[PDB]
Design a protein around this ligand. Structure first.
Ligand code: VXR
Length: 559
């Protein structure tokens, strides 16, 4: 029951890898302590392998099965449709990994005959063959972090032709089933403000609120063949075309359950018997499996009035405190139950009685004040990683622009507004690229977004309050200030000055550019403006922006 097996061949890169933070003429204006930023490479792949390789044990009891039966009952009310080849193709990221069969993402998106014919042939093979394991590629991810160094994460994905077939058979499923099965507990259905709203309204729902987060040690490796088959049983509960049932069955047996691992050089690196992190069902499956195990675990632990919030492998639980002593005991029972379900904790879960002290999805609730001085809750997080990546993206263009995604997701925060917005808008203006669409990711899906639309986008996801928040909490203030000292980032005084400069230059531009200056940097001037709803803000089609998670799902969308 080992998560993985290895032949000994090394996980190889498909291009030159940089470890040290690239430096340019802009670097210092943001960060001085360059040696604290690094990017993980294949060189550490070996360390990760040893961490994610272990034997799994599972003891499923009646609570587990009772929760599963309930989940299947909700799942049966779901009706999913097969996606056409064209539809699935249009969902393919312009820069997705090219197929090993003579065509790439560009060919897929343009519906080239070669790409369509191969896709159709792969689809046919899935319907006729439900046994032969599908090949996958294992790569060491290149991610940027701040020191104090972690080994590179691994990514396992099948060929482009297969990814397109996954979409056809399961896109509609993984996009709609989770919300029906888990209801208000499915986190990807909420925007940042909606997630904060759900957490506060839930916290208040309890007379004696108590909450905690649960971090499973390498969740993907804890997923057993049973878990993957259980997820399939849930999918099959949906009303599906017979052709889709066969495709989902086949993908489960040949890909999801496990298969061979091939490095970028074509050598067999080993075999996988756990969750593949680079497939379409990675997010939905982890969310379903985490919710199933945690729900059953809550019962075993006898937690009162439990309200859960699940996002992939990230879990949040808010319930009725039965006392400080009893809570601690319950939590331990919960952990023991989770462990029996093959989901041991990486870090011991601790009970919190202060919402702001609960961190889930690397984030936490905090409070500030809007123009009217009213108390307003918002989602924030430790700026360290976001700032380390912003430095890298300062001297190196990357496939994913983390700074953009961070600005969109945490626009109300002190650090995103003061630093991220000021810094990158200054750069955009200098290169006159304000209107250039850039790629960023929201909940694992890729989106092409033009900086000039940030104002309208932020107003839609956070409301005008994001443009005028102030008097942040002492806790948040200290955490940001510490980060800035650690990384060597200029003080507010400096950023405010740079913001006025950027703001003035934007206003001169006019059009949307001026809108960016007026709204994004109204906090910089001494005499703030009124700031009213943006007209074109209703034209934006953010329908599929916050519906589900697609981490590793190879999903694309054009705004
Ligand atoms: C990171 C270290 C730090 C210094 C001061 C604070 C706390 C601040 S600044 C602020 N408001 C200003 C602001 C500065 C930068 C921003 F990005 C937003 C708001 C502001 N001026 N005019 N309107 N609002 N409110 C607080 O509690 O944190």
């Amino acid at each position: 029951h080992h998560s993985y097996t290895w032949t000994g061949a090394l996980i190889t890169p498909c291009a030159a890898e940089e470890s040290k933070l690239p430096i340019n003429a802009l670097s210092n204006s943001l960060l001085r302590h360059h040696n604290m930023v690094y990017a993980t490479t294949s060189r550490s792949a070996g360390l990760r392998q040893k961490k994610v390789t272990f034997d799994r044990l599972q003891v499923l009891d009646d609570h587990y099965r009772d929760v599963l039966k309930e989940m299947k009952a909700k799942a049966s009310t779901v009706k999913a449709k097969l996606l056409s080849v064209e539809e699935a193709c249009k969902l393919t990221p312009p820069h997705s990994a090219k197929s090993k069969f003579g065509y790439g993402a560009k060919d897929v998106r343009n519906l080239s005959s070669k790409a369509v014919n191969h896709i159709h042939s792969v689809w046919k093979d899935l319907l006729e063959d439900t046994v032969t394991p599908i090949d996958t590629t294992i790569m060491a991810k290149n991610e940027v972090f701040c020191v104090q160094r972690k080994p590179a994460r691994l990514i396992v994905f099948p060929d482009l032709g297969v990814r397109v077939c996954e979409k056809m058979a399961l896109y509609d499923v993984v996009s709609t089933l989770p919300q029906v099965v888990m209801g208000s507990s499915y986190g990807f259905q909420y925007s940042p403000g909606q997630r904060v709203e759900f957490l506060v309204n839930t916290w208040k729902s309890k007379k004696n609120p108590m909450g905690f987060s649960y971090d499973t040690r390498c969740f993907d490796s804890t997923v057993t063949e049973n878990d993957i088959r259980v997820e399939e049983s849930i999918y099959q509960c949906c009303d599906l075309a017979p052709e889709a049932r066969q495709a989902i069955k086949s993908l489960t047996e040949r890909l999801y359950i496990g298969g061979p691992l091939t490095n970028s050089k074509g050598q067999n690196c080993g075999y996988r018997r756990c969750r593949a992190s680079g497939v379409l069902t990675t997010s939905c499956g982890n969310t379903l499996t985490c919710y199933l195990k945690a729900s059953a675990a809550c019962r075993a632990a006898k937690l009162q009035d439990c309200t859960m919030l699940v996002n992939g492998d990230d879990l949040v639980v808010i319930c009725e405190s039965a006392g400080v002593q009893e809570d601690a005991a319950s939590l331990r029972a919960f952990t023991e139950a989770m462990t029996r379900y093959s989901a041991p904790p990486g870090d011991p879960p601790q009970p919190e009685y202060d919402l702001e002290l609960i961190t889930s999805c690397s984030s936490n609730v905090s409070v500030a004040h809007d123009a009217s001085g009213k108390r307003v809750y918002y989602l924030t997080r430790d700026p360290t990683t976001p700032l380390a990546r912003a430095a890298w993206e300062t001297a190196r263009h990357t496939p994913v622009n983390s700074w953009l995604g961070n600005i969109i997701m945490y626009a109300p925060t002190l650090w995103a507004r003061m630093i991220l917005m000021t810094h990158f808008f200054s750069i955009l203006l200098a290169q006159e690229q304000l209107e250039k669409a850039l790629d960023c990711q929201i909940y694992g899906a890729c989106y092409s977004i033009e900086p000039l639309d940030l104002p309208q986008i932020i107003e839609r996801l956070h409301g005008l309050s994001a443009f005028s928040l102030h008097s942040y909490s002492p806790g948040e203030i200290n955490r940001v200030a510490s980060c800035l000292r650690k990384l060597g980032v200029p003080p507010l005084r400096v950023w405010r000055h740079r913001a006025r400069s950027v703001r003035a230059r934007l206003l001169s531009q006019g059009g949307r550019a001026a809108t960016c200056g007026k709204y994004l940097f109204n906090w910089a001037v001494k005499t703030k403006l009124k700031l009213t709803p943006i007209p074109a803000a209703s034209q934006l089609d953010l329908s599929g922006w916050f519906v589900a998670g697609y981490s590793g799902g190879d999903i694309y969308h054009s705004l």
